[PDB]
Amino acid sequence: STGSATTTPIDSLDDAYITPVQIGTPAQTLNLDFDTGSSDLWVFSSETTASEVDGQTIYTPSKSTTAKLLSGATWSISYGDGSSSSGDVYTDTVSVGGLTVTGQAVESAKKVSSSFTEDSTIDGLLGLAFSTLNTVSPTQQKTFFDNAKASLDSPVFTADLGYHAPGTYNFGFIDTTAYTGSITYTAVSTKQGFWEWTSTGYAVGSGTFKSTSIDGIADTGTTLLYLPATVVSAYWAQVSGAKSSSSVGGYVFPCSATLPSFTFGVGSARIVIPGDYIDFGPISTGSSSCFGGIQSSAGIGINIFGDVALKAAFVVFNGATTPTLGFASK
């Protein structure tokens, strides 16, 4: 089997991407944030505290003939940005782009933090990291990808995120028309439950490439590119007027600037992030100070290849017995 679904930016800055997902019988379609940095499929639901729902589409398990309470199971998750959610668990039929999994754990939110409530466009998350990170207790549950894997033509999914435009998540096949040149594969460590890999270095604009190992995670659920302070300082030093602002919470730059590109290494290959991808616009409405798309990972504890980086590539998440990550230009 295979699946193919279009993923769409939630706003004009590509802050996140939503992908329609069919849950239950008859289908209830919710728009989920596919997150390769976590491993829970959770949804706004009929059980979500009413004051914490503001415009989201909800899953109502009582209206699904295939929903079954997973007795005794609870979940609770906290994300890197300080947001969180928790609730109980149903199993139900879940389909993405024509690919169907029966008995998928659908984690129903009883509580969500303010950032989720305030984002009317995201009806939940679909985790695509390794199932060892799944938060269901007392019986850990498998991700949609893990459940689908055996049925897939090939044990892979691909992320093809757009810049200010729709893109695609595919399951079970590599669309050879979706990228240019060849795909370069690189080793993955699953030790922390993430798609964790080591970039071979970077360049700023037309500058020379610096060979240096940068361990980090491929994370579709994080907006920006978080890298070591040394790397980030070297980037922003090439932008007149750029500075790190503790009050704003990162590097800002004059909105009048033209940003240089940023290149990262994948083995001997190179992925180029155009400068425009690094512009996240005014810090507040009408400001001439703009927020940078490359920020320091110092005190996150991990480097994060978020959407800023991933949307510059066609990315293969290879879930074979020995997992790997592939990157191509597009």
Curated annotation (Swiss-Prot):
The keyword Disulfide bond applies. Disulfide bonds join 255-290. GO terms for molecular function: aspartic-type endopeptidase activity. Its EC number is 3.4.23.22. The active site is at residues 35, 199. One of its GO terms (biological process) is proteolysis. It is an enzyme of class 3 (hydrolase). Keywords: Aspartyl protease, Disulfide bond, Hydrolase, Protease, Signal, Zymogen. Belongs to the peptidase A1 family. This is Endothiapepsin. It comes from Cryphonectria parasitica. The chain holds residues 90 to 419 of 419 of the full protein.
